[PDB]
């Protein structure tokens, strides 16, 4: 019973970094990956990046440069940072598991959890 | 006792009675004629002897031999679950081997038509060699083993060895060995040959992995009554210098004294399996830790046990440290890593040193007024007093026993891919094709039978353990079966290490 | 990398299997097993359907969906449409570069 | 019975030691098991971060030499144990005064773990001990236990232990208790010092033999202004990696504390340190505490501060002068030799070889015996008294209990073997 | 008082030729990290430990413990011409007194096909122990290599050279000879 809700923002300015976290609920951080991943409107999904829980990290290379993540395990959420937000950023913003078995060297490619989604507007 | 009498029935199935389990494995092998019955000297020169390293000289023979050596000869995947769950460490004791149904095929080509008939008084030569002279290369892990899976027919592997060299050139003191030196027995197709064997004393392997670790040992609640120095200056300035000393407890934990360190260290390289994480160079062969023995190089393959990560980093692996299975129908160059199964033997952590780290500091010189204390990085560690450690997990896929070189002296000889190390373990077993050439060759049935000896668990834990399991999942194939065209697949490397014990 | 390419759209009348493609270079599609589908609603969050090219989820996910891999191309199957059927669908792989990347998605529409 | 004793106090040694005392046990953590890590103490840091719990039962602890003795080689052969004269007392707090009386029908349990079930923290150095005097009256203390962590948090391997789950001896105050323990077979420790050295058993002689492994330490000079000017406590010493988590060597491998001559020199993190009577806790003076010296193993062992020797860093040639460089660390060669760590009347007596496939001379590093099957641990609890439950029923367990502690006596009776 | 039998023999084969030049391996090694001759080009490839590579294969024992020495010439002209018979030999240090490695631990003598070299320290007088270079490592040489740091897209990786190393589990030797 893993839920995802995640929080933030409706509308930003251009120029300036945005910050979303995500709160798993009913389960635990654990040993997953944590991705995040944005849907402009009326637009295919794009995975922006996860994170580990010992801070490891992989981000889409087209958004790498202005990408940051961190996961927090006391406070049981995950977060995102995006710099210089401009009109293109305006998405719904997911945070989805993705699942990953300890231990063995699978890569971890799916998402089998899903928030319900936060929807962010860039503009002036 | 006849040509239309069966000599042996077939037997396939495992025994559980209580602390020891009797498998019982039983397959259809084939025999070719091997070099045209002829001896013939190998060397790498023969195929172009490229490197140093890579330089041998020996000889093949035209005898092949029966590879029993790997799990899951023995192990169906349903007894190696229902083994692992349940058991604290296992060991073999008995082996009963057996040979019959000999079957020979003579071959007759005329033009594009091959005809194939019996020949009914043709024999086959086998013998097993219980004195260790010759030889012995079933603990370098070889493929031609026993199918997995009991309905496949295998074919028996070439017997050939290596001796001294120098390049490619033998040398003096180099040994030659005839195998038809050997008293043997001769069978007919109503003969049969069967031996038993004892396994020697081994230890139990450890199937379980320990649920503590080797710096966390203390009474939390507790100080310890030793001190420890915590301060070397009072302040912030000239001449502060001071001699302080805080007691080691609860709070701080990495200072307290300890009656026992980690086993030893030869630090790896690590890889990480995030291709992008990786240096954009060629340091598969640069970058490895090896050792050099007469002047030629050697990869550190396995190597001492240690763990393959450290905590929180799944992804890297040491570049030789692990053991590296193919998956069915896996290609032999160049394969892709989705298709190899890499082992992991991060369950050692708690008294082992992680690979791809050094073992710690040490003090590099004499700290003075004038002079700060400097640490160097202790890259490789052997045996100090005090330390323990852990051997490397055994597989389903992997290698049982080896043979302990016969020497002056060796160091805790279990060996270092994994399993049994024994100064007399189970004996080759030689056979070939008796002459006639008429193209000729034989088929027939091996049973291998062995007793294995059972640790249980009495553990108090209360909360549930590990556990190997099949998932409960939708898919196309089952896990270990056969697919639509009949080919059978090991889908992960399957470790020994689910129970968990104090420290 | 480069974005897995999917058509636009797909339509069939209820009761009769449809097949969606997803092509792929052979470094995505191509040289792994990793294939995913999702589907998604309008207004709310995807739904993983396929994983490992042909594995279904536990639960949630009917027989009806079948995935299946040749080449550079993967395929969604599915069989007796029903009107909850219709839904967006992306492919998404795992690439050489170590990344993720999805399809454009493809609309399906029930007659 | 109530007005009879169930033990008679015995206090001579004979060699077979004899200790007796007095203790006191309270109820631990209000009859409960509480999870504990470093977050639940403030959270630490990496190398600090632990998971684990904490038990209601206590635990005796006479792994003190200076327990079983008043002020060439020996070791332990039987054990005998016994408890008695307990008495459970109550204690009401009212207003101005508390007040103690006797609880006649309340017990105690007690039980040892003779198939190492539990996790042993017999063997780590704790306070707790009998005292060394045969006078004072000791509190019991506390039993817990430490986990696998990835932090402070725990993972699926952790395991937890319930000591309910033991049978266990319930002791009313007429009962009493006793066991016997065999000690394995384990070599003398060596109570002498060499006449000889092993070199001079004359520096390019050949050797049959050479000293034993080394780990080198930072040197410290007891005279303050010898030292440097900078802190070097901990980011100057030697330490070993775990996991990611790196622990100080302490005492680590037997070695010299000090070459001939000079004295005033302590391996940094390798000795043991003691405290003299009423030293505090925390950044106390060199005098306020006893460093101990190795010096006695010098024959034998090299010096903890000294590098181990040098080795050839190259091949010479007609182009190229010999290199030589120095070895901070050595393990074993064969033909190495070399002296175990000396025992103290302060310091330990054995510890638990830990279970694991392999282990290399697994005498203790901080001194003492170094057992597979050592003594068990003996494991004591008040059991609870629930105070007056409700006149309706109610599932929840109940969390109010009678206010109340134990007293007693207890017995040891270690036998040794002399050399 | 009952010891073992002193070792009077020369093995025929060496520690790292026990295996079946035949057959393949079934263990896998990584050969191959970069698709080569580009930017970022990062890959993981593994091949079947073979006969044709016999240097990467999978071993269940490995060389005995050694400390190194210096080399020396029996031709004067070989050797540097300075005095560094005490100055380069190899010692170990006890209670701050510098005592020569002599002989030291049994290590083979020279690599094969080198006659004329011998340890400054290490052999009798002049002795050779050819005959355990098949298990022992030579006396004149690094043990091997070790990784010295973790590489990264940043980092190159590195390794350093092992002048002396202690007993390891998996360590057979063969001892001097009489």
């Known amino acids: 019973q893993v839920q995802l809700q995640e929080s933030g923002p409706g509308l930003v300015k251009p120029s300036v970094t945005l910050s979303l976290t995500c709160t798993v609920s009913?389960?635990?951080?654990?040993?997953?990956?944590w991705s995040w991943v944005r849907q402009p409107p009326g637009k295919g999904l794009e995975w922006i990046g996860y994170?580990?829980?010992?801070?490891?990290?992989n981000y889409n290379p087209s958004l790498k440069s202005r990408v940051t993540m961190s996961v927090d395990t006391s406070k049981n959420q995950f977060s995102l940072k995006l710099n210089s937000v401009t009109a293109a950023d305006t998405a719904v913003y997911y945070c989805?598991?993705?699942?990953?078995?300890?231990?063995?060297?699978?890569?971890?490619?799916?998402?089998?959890?899903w928030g319900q989604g936060t929807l962010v507007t860039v503009s002036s | 006792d006849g040509v239309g009498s069966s000599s042996g029935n077939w037997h396939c199935d495992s025994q559980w009675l209580g602390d020891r389990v009797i498998t019982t494995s039983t397959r259809t092998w084939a025999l070719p004629t091997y070099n045209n019955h002829l001896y013939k000297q190998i060397s790498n020169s023969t195929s172009g002897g490229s490197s140093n390293d890579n330089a041998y000289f020996g000889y093949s023979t035209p005898w092949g031999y029966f590879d029993f050596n790997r799990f899951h000869c023995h192990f169906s995947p349903r007894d190696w679950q229902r083994l692992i769950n349940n058991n604290w460490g296992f060991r073999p004791k008995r082996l009963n081997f057996k040979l019959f149904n000999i079957q020979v095929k003579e071959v007759t080509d005329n033009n594009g038509v091959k005809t194939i008939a019996n020949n009914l008084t043709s024999t086959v030569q086998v013998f097993t060699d219980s004195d260790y002279q010759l030889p012995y290369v079933l603990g370098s892990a070889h493929e031609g083993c026993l199918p997995p899976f009991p309905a496949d027919v295998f074919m028996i592997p070439q017997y050939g060895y290596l001796t001294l060299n120098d390049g490619s050139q033998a040398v003096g003191r180099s040994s030659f060995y005839c195998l038809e030196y050997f008293p043997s027995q001769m069978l007919r197709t109503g003969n049969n040959f069967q031996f038993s064997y004892e396994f020697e004393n081994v230890p139990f392997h450890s199937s379980y992995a320990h649920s503590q670790s080797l710096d966390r040992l203390m009474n939390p609640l507790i100080d310890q009554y030793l001190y420890y120095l915590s301060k070397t200056i009072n302040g912030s300035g000239q001449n502060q210098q001071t001699l302080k000393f805080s007691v080691a407890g609860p709070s701080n934990m990495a200072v307290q004294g300890r009656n026992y360190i980690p086993g030893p260290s030869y630090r790896q390289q690590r890889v990480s399996t995030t291709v992008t994480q990786n240096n954009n160079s060629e340091f598969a062969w640069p970058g490895a830790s090896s050792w050099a023995l007469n002047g030629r190089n050697s990869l550190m393959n396995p190597g001492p046990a240690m763990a393959s990560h450290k905590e929180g980093e799944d992804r890297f692996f040491p570049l030789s440290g692990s053991l590296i299975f193919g998956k069915q129908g896996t290609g032999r160059d160049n394969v892709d890593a989705d298709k190899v199964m890499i082992t992991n033997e991060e369950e050692i952590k708690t008294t082992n040193p992680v690979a791809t780290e050094s073992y710690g500091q040490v003090a590099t010189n004499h700290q003075s007024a004038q002079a700060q204390a400097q640490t160097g990085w202790v890259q490789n560690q052997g045996i100090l007093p005090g330390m323990v450690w852990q051997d490397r997990d055994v597989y389903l896929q992997g290698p049982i026993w080896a043979k302990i070189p016969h020497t002056d002296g060796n160091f805790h000889p279990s060996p270092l891919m994994g399993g049994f190390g024994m100064k007399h373990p189970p004996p080759q077993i030689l056979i070939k094709n008796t002459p006639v050439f008429i193209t000729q060759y034989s088929t027939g049935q091996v049973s291998v039978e062995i007793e294995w000896e059972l640790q249980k668990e009495n553990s108090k834990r209360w909360n549930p353990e590990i556990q190997y399991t099949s998932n409960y999942y939708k898919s196309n194939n089952v896990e270990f079966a056969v697919n639509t065209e009949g080919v059978y697949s090991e889908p992960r490397p399957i470790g020994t290490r689910y129970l968990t014990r104090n420290l | 990398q480069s974005a897995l390419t999917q058509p636009a759209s797909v339509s069939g009348s209820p009761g009769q299997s449809i097949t969606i493609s997803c092509t792929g270079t052979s470094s995505d599609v191509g040289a792994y097993d990793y294939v995913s589908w999702y589907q998604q609603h309008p207004g709310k969050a995807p739904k993983l359907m396929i994983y490992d090219v042909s594995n279904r989820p536990s639960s949630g996910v009917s027989n009806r969906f079948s995935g299946s891999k040749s080449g550079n191309t993967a395929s969604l199957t599915i069989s007796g449409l029903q009107a909850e059927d219709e839904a967006d669908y992306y492919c998404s792989s795992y690439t050489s570069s170590s990344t993720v990347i999805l399809g454009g998605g493809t609309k399906l529409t029930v007659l | 019975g109530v007005g009879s004793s169930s033990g008679n106090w015995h206090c001579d040694s004979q060699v077979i030691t004899t200790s007796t005392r007095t203790w006191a046990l309270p109820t631990y953590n209000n009859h409960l098991y509480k999870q504990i890590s470093n977050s639940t103490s403030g959270g630490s840091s990496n190398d600090n971060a632990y998971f684990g719990y904490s038990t209601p039962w206590g635990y005796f602890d006479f792994n003190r030499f200076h327990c079983h003795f008043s002020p060439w080689g020996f070791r332990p052969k039987r054990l005998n144990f016994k408890l008695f004269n307990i008495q459970v007392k109550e204690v009401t707090d009212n207003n101005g005064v508390k007040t103690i009386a006797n609880n006649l029908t309340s017990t105690v349990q007690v039980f040892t773990d003779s198939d190492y079930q539990l996790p042993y923290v017999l063997g780590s150095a704790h306070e707790g001990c009998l005292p060394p005097f045969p006078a004072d009256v000791f509190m019991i203390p506390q039993y817990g236990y430490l986990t696998l962590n990835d932090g402070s948090q725990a993972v699926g391997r952790s395991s937890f232990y319930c000591l309910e789950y033991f049978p266990s001896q319930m002791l009313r105050t007429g009962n009493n208790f006793q066991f016997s323990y065999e000690f394995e077979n384990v070599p003398f420790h060596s109570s002498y010092a060499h006449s000889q050295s092993l070199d001079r058993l004359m520096a390019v002689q050949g050797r049959n033999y050479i000293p034993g492994p080394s780990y080198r330490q930072q040197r410290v000079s007891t005279t303050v202004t010898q030292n440097n000017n900078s802190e070097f406590a901990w980011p100057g010493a030697s330490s070993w990696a775990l996991n990611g988590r790196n622990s100080l060597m302490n005492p680590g491998p037997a070695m010299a504390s000090h070459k001939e001559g000079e004295d005033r020199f302590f391996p940094l993190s390798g000795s043991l340190i003691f405290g003299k009577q009423g030293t505090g806790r925390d950044n106390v003076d060199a005098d306020k505490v006893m460093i101990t010296n190795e010096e006695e193993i010098k024959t034998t062992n090299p010096v903890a501060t000294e590098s181990y020797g040098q080795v050839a860093t190259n091949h010479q040639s007609a182009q190229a002068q010999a290199q030589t460089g120095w070895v901070q660390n050595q393990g074993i060669l064969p033909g190495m030799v070399w002296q175990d760590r000396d025992v103290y009347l302060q310091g330990p007596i054995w510890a638990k070889i830990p279970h694991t496939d392999g282990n290399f001379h697994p005498s203790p590093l901080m001194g003492g015996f170094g057992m597979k099957h050592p003594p068990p641990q003996i494991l004591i609890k008040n059991t609870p008294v629930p105070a007056d439950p409700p006149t309706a029923f109610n599932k929840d367990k109940l969390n109010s209990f009678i206010t109340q502690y134990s007293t007693g006596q207890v017995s040891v009776e270690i036998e040794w073997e002399l050399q | 008082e009952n010891v073992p039998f002193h070792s009077s023999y020369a093995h025929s084969q060496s520690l790292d030729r026990l295996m079946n030049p035949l057959i393949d391996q079934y263990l896998y090694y990584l050969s191959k990290t970069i698709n080569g001759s580009g930017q970022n080009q990062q890959t993981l490839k593994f091949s079947v430990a073979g006969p044709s590579n016999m240097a990467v294969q999978g071993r269940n024992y490995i060389p005995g413990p050694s400390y190194r020495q210096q080399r020396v010439s029996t031709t004067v002209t070989q050797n540097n011409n300075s005095e560094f018979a005490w100055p380069g030999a190899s010692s170990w240090a006890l209670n701050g007194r510098n005592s020569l490695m002599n002989p030291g631990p049994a290590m083979a003598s020279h690599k094969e096909g080198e006659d004329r070299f011998f340890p400054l320290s290490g052999s009798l007088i002049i002795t050779n122990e050819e005959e355990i270079k098949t298990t022992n490592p030579v006396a004149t040489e690094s043990y091997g290599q070790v990784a010295t740091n973790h590489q990264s897209a940043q980092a190159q990786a590195q390794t350093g050279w092992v002048q002396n190393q202690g007993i390891l589990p998996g360590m057979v030797w063969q001892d001097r000879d009489v």
């Open positions: 989805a598991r993705t699942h990953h078995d300890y231990g063995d060297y699978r890569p971890s490619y799916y998402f089998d959890y």
């Open positions: 009913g389960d635990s951080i654990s040993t997953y990956y």
């Open positions: 994170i580990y829980y010992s801070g490891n990290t």
